[PDB]
């Protein structure tokens, strides 16, 4: 509620209004504080969900999901600091403003009270993200990532507004989710498929199916300095949750056609992870993880029958961190050596000993050792999706193999002798290198102690 | 390598007694430790519906249990000493002998 | 940890080379130039490194055969391999 | 099996005119060490074979591509093909399993989960 | 499997024995061979294939076992005679390939 | 910031001697059989002119091989052809193409028939006919 | 420190090194003779063979067998 | 490889795979001259095709009779505990990033290092430019004049000359 | 080959010259620096085991009857030494 | 360095400590004494013998 948007918009002139170089520490100081407010009135119910205003129930829903969104902001200025210190302050004042200008809508969205505040705010980004990709790129291939990032996201999300304005005047008012207490079903026709297909395909083009992901590595391979907005674009994607607000209801009873979204993404899950093994560019190698065990949720959501939402929620915020943090490693190791080519960096682990245990705990949580959230987020997937049909144990059982050769080959490539020609790579990871790389593995594993705070209603 | 080993006694009095005890024990347990382990099997479950192949198959494996042992015994503990000169061997090792015993 | 010096390598190499009855043990040791005791083209150079491997025992690289003219040359670089004298 | 791999072949004396196959490389390791030994460098080396290793691999194909040879229309045997198959496997199940859930009861009554 | 009639209580893992479970039995020798008291058979903790013959006998074996705790031996004659109960039973059950051999031959 | 003509262009025959070696010397003389030829089965955009392919296979072999480095560690200046399967592949074994394993893996398959029988020890085989009688045959008492 | 001195072994012994005679029907003969004969002699001529290797004297067996057998003994 | 020395690479390995086949130390030794007999059977004759059948048929009867799991001389191109110790590897030039109070230790050694650099600080003007005089155009194997004609400093300094030790 | 005369015998006075510089241990070359400052050894085993044994049982004595069904311990396995006659021995 | 406490061998066959082997040999008894009770008292099989069930009557 205004408890949140108002201070975080109050942030906005906490920055430029300041002096010279004090700016970074000025806003990083406050931006942490809001996290007390983040929890503050939140983590109330529980049962019979919280709605505190007419057009906002901040998050009740058991999709808390908002606490993270308020984390990643003052993880950027620790992240983004590296080469952004080399241009002017009135531009550096900008890049902190639009970056907030993103953070303000992700608080608006995830609440939205309804469908039609979601959408205009579901499309309300792409103004702030697109401007961070095109400027402050690195290569010159960036200019095409500008377009491809649109012309999909916007391409098929217009058929929403044709459909959601079609519901508003058909049955009552969509003004509120919390009233669905009248919903008739959707039986069949050659019209209703389209309705269901229009109310869906806009979401898929964000969390990729194995088709129409053609943009995802185009934008991430070449993308701002620190992953500065690349950490944010790994929040944006998973935020396609809203399919959890719809497909639970609002055409419940068409599962009839589900199968082309099952067998299409269920054989890609065994697939695009395997086209990730021979990659020669590291920020590509991680970008294809992000498809894979993200695209497993799309077979979690379509199937009804909780024990999937038990396991589908834990995943949106499962790689929400692990897949975040890897883009933070591959950034750092790139500061020192200016190729992103994976081969070139070898013979590390002697020269940066403390950063050894940083790779490991990262690459260990794609392996998903049993105790952490990762498996307890996957093993509620397999338990329901097994009951669907027994044969799902094979493919998604293969996923649990190729992903293990997948991860290690990234670490074990950095255990070798190489002294080779590098006179660079002196800096022994000054604190920010290891400070911002923490505040992930500390908060991540921690939740396993009381992991009832990440769960759906079911 | 099992090549370049030599014989039983060159300053290895105790350790070579550890081999010929254990490496005897694993051979079918005449009175020794596992006398209740490998010995109480082929004499008990061997009366059953067994596939009439494993009986052929397993008991033959029991044979090689000898040549397992005796091979790495006879190249290391038996033949003439063969290995390059300047061999420093010292077995007086409080932090070792304490362990085997 | 085993102590190593430059004397034994002048001795050991002198030693077995003085053990072979094909060589009289009045002959030069540190420098004979070995071309007087190269006879013939083969069966010397690769012949002499057949035994000397039996004591130290590292690999005796191929392209290091042509360094074996000088009897001080063989002992010369064996110091550089095993990390020998200061 | 994989492979011979031809550790001996014909030779001797033909193609002894072939020399300066090393002059190609010997030039560089002279120049490379002429690069690599300098007091003041502190930085990585160009190493073009790597620049031409990725950039002639990742990009620079759809530019080079042509949709012509029917060995490049091969992929219908690869990309779409098994994706139909997995539909054929499933859609029979989820039905064979469904028919029995109606007439006749396969499960027990201590299954609440699901 | 002597009396094949029904079971008042349905408890399987044959908590419903025919009466007491034999190995096979009788057929004639012994028509009623007689074992031990069932009320005490599962009143103690008694595994299956501990319900065969020589239940009365082996219930005593453990009695003394529990008697001298800091001891490695109780009765090596009883454990020997435990065969003399069991060996005598088993050999008495070696006779079922003797009868069926010559009984199922010509007549 | 390599300026012009970074990588392969539209081959695989654009004056074969113009490429290797203009830059990127795969072949010395423009015929080493390293000429930027190996566009075998084209129309697949894969591997254009490419100061590159079918140069032979099965490994860099990682041994003494010591002009300087020459294989997988130490990075000679520029040979690179294709790679990335080379850290999980080596050369010629002692035998050649003998599948005796499918023989031995089927060696027990002979004893599949040994499965259809039983091993019952007592009594012996004693060739019989109608003597078998696993449980009972004739009357009970 | 001069310990590895020559003029020492120069084979006399070693029925395995008597094949110099066996090859004398062709002849080489020994040279180099004493390298493989370095340690061929000395206390390495014994090298206890079969079961006596795994008996190790059979020391306590038939002496300590009745050590417990027996004092009452009825 | 020059046709003369081509038997060496076989003559090196020939007896090598032998010894891993024999067991007794005399067995290797007893077959020495006996199998040594075959080499000089034709000792002096043509270098070309006439004696190429000493190279030609050497292929078979060797590869045939190969792989009795040879003795590998543990620290070497292959086999166990060869490259084993990398946990040190001596990353020469570890002396850069310190933040002294870590530099209090080995003061005599920090004194010595900066004394080595003066050679490599300026040895170049005649060190590099002589390589512009030394190799006229396409020169094969690239070492300088072995002395460098007065004082090499190192010249190959210091990467090959100061390189990393083994422990 | 002769040609290596003038070369690498400089290395013998160069490599072994660096290695010559290398080995140093006078004056305790770990400064350290600053600063200040078996029978019993009877509380080390006590700080080891006797702290937990207290803590762990304080979590039990106050506990076993708290949980409705806690530790599941099995039956006594009674033998005919209490209320019973044998009666065989048969 | 560390110490000289034992010098190596040129194949002069180094000497033992003389408490090395005796202290071990007392564990050559524990196999040869503990093998005592095998045949005393136990035979190749302690069984009882199946008496050929002749009474098919
Ligand atoms: C949390 C989970 C802990 C258990 C997994 C970690 C295993 C222990 C470990 O860190 O090994 C580091 C060790 C570092 O190796 P290194 O690169 O040679 O050391 C370089 C530097 O010394 C840097 O590496 P390091 O070995 O020196 O590690 C630093 C550590 C070393 O000093 C230690 O105290 C040892 C830490 C071990 C236990 C840590 C706390 C256990 C709870 O110092 C600290 O612990 C800082 C105090 C942190 C206190 C945290 C209190 C709660 C917050 O090994 C690893 O890199 C892998 C660790 C992961 C093991 C597998 C985990 C899954 C099983
Ligand atoms: C393709 C275009 C074909 C669309 C067919 C026409 C859509 C339609 O008729 O909608 C069906 C129905 C509204 O029409 P009607 O049946 O008359 O409703 C009854 C009112 N009493 O119900 C509806 O209101 C559905 C209207 C929303 C459907 C709009 C989206 C349809 C096509 C979406 C394609 C999905 C993405 C493909 C495009 C991306 C690439 C460009």
From Swiss-Prot, chain A:
It is a multi-pass membrane protein. It is found in: Mitochondrion inner membrane. Its EC number is 7.1.1.2. The chain crosses the membrane at residues 22-42, 60-80, 94-112, 116-138, 147-167, 196-216, 224-244, 256-276, 284-303, 308-330, 351-371, 393-413, 435-455. The modification N-formylmethionine is found at residue 1. Belongs to the complex I subunit 4 family. Core subunit of the mitochondrial membrane respiratory chain NADH dehydrogenase (Complex I) which catalyzes electron transfer from NADH through the respiratory chain, using ubiquinone as an electron acceptor. Essential for the catalytic activity and assembly of complex I. This is NADH-ubiquinone oxidoreductase chain 4. The gene is MT-ND4.
From Swiss-Prot, chain B:
Disulfide bonds: none annotated. Coiled coil: none annotated. It is found in: Mitochondrion inner membrane. The chain crosses the membrane at residues 12-32, 59-79. It comes from the Eukaryota. Belongs to the complex I subunit 5 family. Core subunit of respiratory chain NADH dehydrogenase (Complex I) which is composed of 45 different subunits. Core subunit of the mitochondrial membrane respiratory chain NADH dehydrogenase (Complex I) which catalyzes electron transfer from NADH through the respiratory chain, using ubiquinone as an electron acceptor. Essential for the catalytic activity and assembly of complex I. This is NADH-ubiquinone oxidoreductase chain 5.
UniProtKB/Swiss-Prot annotation, chain G:
The chain crosses the membrane at residues 48-70. It comes from the Eukaryota. It is found in: Mitochondrion inner membrane. It is a single-pass membrane protein. The keyword Membrane applies. The keyword Nucleotidyltransferase does not apply. One of its GO terms (biological process) is mitochondrial respiratory chain complex I assembly. GO terms for cellular component: mitochondrial inner membrane; mitochondrion; respiratory chain complex I. Keywords: Acetylation, Electron transport, Membrane, Methylation, Mitochondrion, Mitochondrion inner membrane, Respiratory chain, Transmembrane, Transmembrane helix, Transport. Methylation at His residues by METTL9 enhances complex I-mediated mitochondrial respiration. The modification N6-succinyllysine is found at residue 10. The modification N6-acetyllysine is found at residue 10. Belongs to the complex I NDUFB3 subunit family. Accessory subunit of the mitochondrial membrane respiratory chain NADH dehydrogenase (Complex I), that is believed not to be involved in catalysis. Complex I functions in the transfer of electrons from NADH to the respiratory chain. The immediate electron acceptor for the enzyme is believed to be ubiquinone. This is NADH dehydrogenase [ubiquinone] 1 beta subcomplex subunit 3. The gene is NDUFB3. The chain holds residues 14 to 87 of 98 of the full protein.
Curated annotation (Swiss-Prot), chain I:
Pfam families: NDUF_B6 (PF09782). InterPro entries: NADH_DH_b-subcmplx_su6. It is found in: Mitochondrion inner membrane. The chain crosses the membrane at residues 38-60. One of its GO terms (biological process) is mitochondrial ATP synthesis coupled electron transport. The modification N6-acetyllysine is found at residue 20. It is a single-pass membrane protein. Its main location: mitochondrion. GO terms for cellular component: mitochondrial inner membrane; mitochondrion; respiratory chain complex I. The keyword RNA-binding does not apply. PANTHER family: NADH DEHYDROGENASE [UBIQUINONE] 1 BETA SUBCOMPLEX SUBUNIT 6. Complex I is composed of 45 different subunits. Belongs to the complex I NDUFB6 subunit family. This is NADH dehydrogenase [ubiquinone] 1 beta subcomplex subunit 6.
């Amino acid at each position: 509620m205004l408890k949140y948007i108002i201070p975080t918009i109050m942030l906005m002139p906490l920055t430029w209004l300041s002096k010279n170089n004090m700016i970074w520490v000025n806003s990083t100081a406050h931006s942490l504080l809001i996290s007390f407010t983040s929890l503050l009135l939140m983590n109330q119910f529980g049962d019979n969900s919280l709605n505190f205003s007419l057009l906002f129930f901040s998050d009740s829903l058991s999709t808390p999901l908002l606490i993270l969104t308020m984390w990643l902001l003052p993880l950027m200025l620790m992240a983004s600091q590296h080469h952004l210190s080399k241009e002017n302050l009135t531009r550096k004042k900008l890049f902190i403003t639009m970056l907030i200008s993103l953070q303000l809508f992700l608080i608006m969205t995830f609440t939205a009270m309804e469908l039609i505040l979601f959408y205009i705010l579901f499309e309300a980004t792409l103004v702030p993200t697109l401007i961070i990709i095109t400027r402050w790129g690195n290569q010159t291939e960036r200019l095409n990532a500008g377009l491809y990032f649109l012309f999909y996201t916007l391409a098929g999300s217009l058929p929403l507004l044709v459909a959601l304005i079609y519901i508003q005047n058909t049955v009552g008012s969509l003004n509120f989710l919390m009233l669905q207490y009248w919903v008739q079903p959707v039986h069949n026709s050659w019209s209703n498929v389209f309705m269901w297909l229009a109310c869906m395909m806009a979401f898929m083009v964000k969390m990729p199916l194995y088709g129409l992901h053609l943009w995802l590595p185009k934008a991430h391979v070449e993308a701002p300095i620190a992953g500065s907005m690349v950490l944010a674009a790994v929040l944006l994607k998973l935020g396609g949750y809203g399919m959890l607000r719809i497909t639970l209801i609002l055409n419940p009873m068409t599962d009839f056609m589900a199968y082309p979204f099952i067998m299409l993404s269920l054989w890609g899950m065994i697939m695009t992870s395997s086209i990730c093994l021979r990659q020669t560019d590291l920020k590509s190698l991680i970008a294809y993880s992000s498809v894979s065990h993200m695209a497993l949720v799309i077979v979690a959501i379509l199937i009804q029958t909780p024990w999937s939402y038990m396991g589908a929620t834990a995943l949106m915020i499962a790689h929400g961190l692990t897949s975040s943090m890897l883009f933070c490693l591959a950034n750092s190791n790139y500061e020192r050596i200016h190729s992103r080519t994976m081969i070139l960096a070898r013979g590390l682990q002697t020269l940066l000993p403390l950063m050894a245990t940083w790779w490991l705990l990262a690459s260990l949580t794609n392996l998903a050792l049993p105790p952490t959230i990762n498996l307890i987020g996957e093993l509620f997937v397999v338990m329901s999706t097994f009951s669907w049909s027994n044969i799902t144990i094979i493919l998604m059982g293969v996923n649990m193999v190729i992903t293990a050769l997948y991860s290690l080959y990234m670490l074990i490539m950095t255990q070798r002798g190489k002294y080779t020609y590098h006179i660079n790579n002196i800096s022994p990871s000054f604190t920010r290198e290891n400070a911002l790389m923490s505040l992930h593995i500390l908060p991540l594993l921690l939740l396993t102690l009381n992991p009832k705070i990440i769960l759906g209603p079911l | 390598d099992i090549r370049k080993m030599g014989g039983l006694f060159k300053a290895m009095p105790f350790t070579t007694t550890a081999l010929i005890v254990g490496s005897l024990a694993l051979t079918g347990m005449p009175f020794l430790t596992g006398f209740y382990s490998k010995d109480l099997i082929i004499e008990a479950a061997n009366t059953s519906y067994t596939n009439a192949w494993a009986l052929l198959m397993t008991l033959i494996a029991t044979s090689f249990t000898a040549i397992y042992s005796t091979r790495i015994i006879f190249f290391a503990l038996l033949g003439q000493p063969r290995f390059p000169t300047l061999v420093n061997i010292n077995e007086n090792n409080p932090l070792l002998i304490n362990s085997i015993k | 940890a085993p102590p190593l010096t430059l004397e034994g390598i002048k001795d050991r190499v002198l030693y077995v080379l003085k053990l072979y009855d094909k060589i009289d043990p009045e002959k030069l040791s540190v420098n004979s130039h070995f071309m007087k005791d190269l006879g013939l083209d083969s069966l010397d150079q690769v012949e002499i490194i057949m035994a000397m491997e039996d004591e130290f025992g590292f690999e005796i690289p191929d392209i290091d055969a042509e360094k074996l003219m000088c009897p001080q040359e063989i002992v010369d670089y064996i110091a550089d391999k095993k990390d020998v004298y200061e | 099996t994989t492979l011979d791999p031809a550790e001996y072949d014909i030779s001797s004396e033909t193609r002894k005119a072939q020399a300066e196959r090393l002059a190609i490389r010997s030039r560089l390791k002279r120049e490379y060490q002429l690069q690599y030994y300098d007091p003041s460098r502190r930085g990585v080396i160009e190493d073009p074979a790597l620049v031409r290793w990725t950039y002639a691999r990742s990009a620079n194909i759809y530019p080079n591509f042509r949709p012509n040879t029917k060995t490049s229309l091969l992929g219908a045997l690869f990309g779409i093909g098994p994706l139909v198959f997995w539909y054929y496997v499933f859609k029979t199940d989820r039905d064979r399993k469904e028919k029995l859930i109606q007439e006749g009861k396969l499960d027990r009554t201590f299954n609440i989960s699901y | 499997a002597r009396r094949y009639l029904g079971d008042a209580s349905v408890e399987p893992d044959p908590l419903r024995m025919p009466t007491f479970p034999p190995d096979y039995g009788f057929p004639e020798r012994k028509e009623r061979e007689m074992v031990a008291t069932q009320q005490e058979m599962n009143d103690a903790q008694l595994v299956l294939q501990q319900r065969d013959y020589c239940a009365h006998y082996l219930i005593r074996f453990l009695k003394c076992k529990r008697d001298s705790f800091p001891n490695f031996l109780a009765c090596k004659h009883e454990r020997h005679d435990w065969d003399y109960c069991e060996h005598l039973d088993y050999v008495k059950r070696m006779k079922e390939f003797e009868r069926e051999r010559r009984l199922l031959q010509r007549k | 910031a390599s300026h012009i003509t970074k990588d392969m262009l539209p081959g695989p025959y654009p004056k074969t001697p113009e490429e290797r070696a203009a830059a990127a010397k795969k072949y010395n003389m423009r015929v080493e059989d390293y000429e930027p030829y190996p566009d075998d089965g084209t129309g697949y955009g894969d591997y254009p002119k490419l100061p590159d392919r079918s140069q032979q296979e099965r490994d860099p072999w990682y041994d003494w091989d010591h002009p300087d480095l020459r294989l997988n560690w130490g990075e000679p200046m520029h040979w690179d052809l294709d790679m990335y399967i080379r850290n999980r592949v080596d050369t010629s074994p002692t035998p050649v193409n003998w599948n005796l394993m499918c023989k031995h893996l089927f060696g027990f398959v002979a004893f599949m028939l040994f499965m259809f029988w039983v091993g019952e020890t007592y009594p012996a085989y004693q060739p019989v006919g109608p003597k078998q009688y696993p449980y009972n045959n004739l009357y009970l008492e | 420190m001069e310990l590895p001195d020559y003029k020492q072994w120069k084979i006399e012994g070693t029925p395995l090194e008597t094949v110099q005679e066996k090859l004398a029907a062709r002849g080489l003969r020994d040279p180099w003779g004493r390298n493989e004969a370095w340690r061929y002699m000395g206390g390495f001529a014994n090298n206890v063979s079969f079961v006596g290797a795994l008996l190790k004297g059979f020391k306590w067996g038939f002496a300590a067998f009745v050590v417990a057998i027996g004092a009452e003994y009825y | 490889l020059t046709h003369q020395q081509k038997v060496l690479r076989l003559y090196k390995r020939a007896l090598r795979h032998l010894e891993s086949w024999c067991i007794h130390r005399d067995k290797y030794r007893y077959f020495a001259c006996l199998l040594r007999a075959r080499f000089d059977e034709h000792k002096n004759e043509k270098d070309m095709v006439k004696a190429t059948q000493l190279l030609r048929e050497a292929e078979e009867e060797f590869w045939h009779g190969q792989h009795p799991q040879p003795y590998i001389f543990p620290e070497s191109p292959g086999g166990t505990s060869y490259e084993r110790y990398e946990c040190y590897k001596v990353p020469e030039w570890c002396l850069d990033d310190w933040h002294p109070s870590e530099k209090a230790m080995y003061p005599d050694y920090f004194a010595k290092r900066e004394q080595w650099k003066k050679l490599r600080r300026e040895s170049w003007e005649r060190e590099v430019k002589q390589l512009q005089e030394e190799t006229p155009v396409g020169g094969p194997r690239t070492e300088a004049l072995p002395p460098a004609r007065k004082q090499g400093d190192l010249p190959p300094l210091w990467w090959h000359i100061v390189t990393r030790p083994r422990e | 080959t002769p040609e290596e005369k003038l070369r690498l015998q400089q290395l013998r006075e160069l490599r072994r010259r660096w290695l010559k510089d290398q080995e140093l241990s006078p004056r305790e070359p770990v400064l350290p620096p600053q600063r200040v400052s078996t029978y019993r050894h009877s509380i080390f085993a006590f700080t080891h085991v006797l702290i937990p044994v207290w803590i762990i049982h304080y979590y039990l004595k106050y506990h076993v009857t708290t949980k409705p069904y806690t530790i599941v311990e099995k039956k006594p396995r009674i033998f005919p030494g209490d209320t019973i006659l044998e009666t065989g021995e048969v | 360095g560390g110490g000289a406490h034992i010098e190596p061998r040129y194949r002069q066959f180094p000497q033992l400590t003389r408490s090395q082997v005796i202290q071990a040999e007392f564990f050559s008894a524990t196999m040869w004494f503990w093998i005592l009770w095998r045949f005393w008292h136990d035979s190749d099989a302690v069984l009882g013998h199946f008496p050929y069930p002749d009474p098919s009557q």
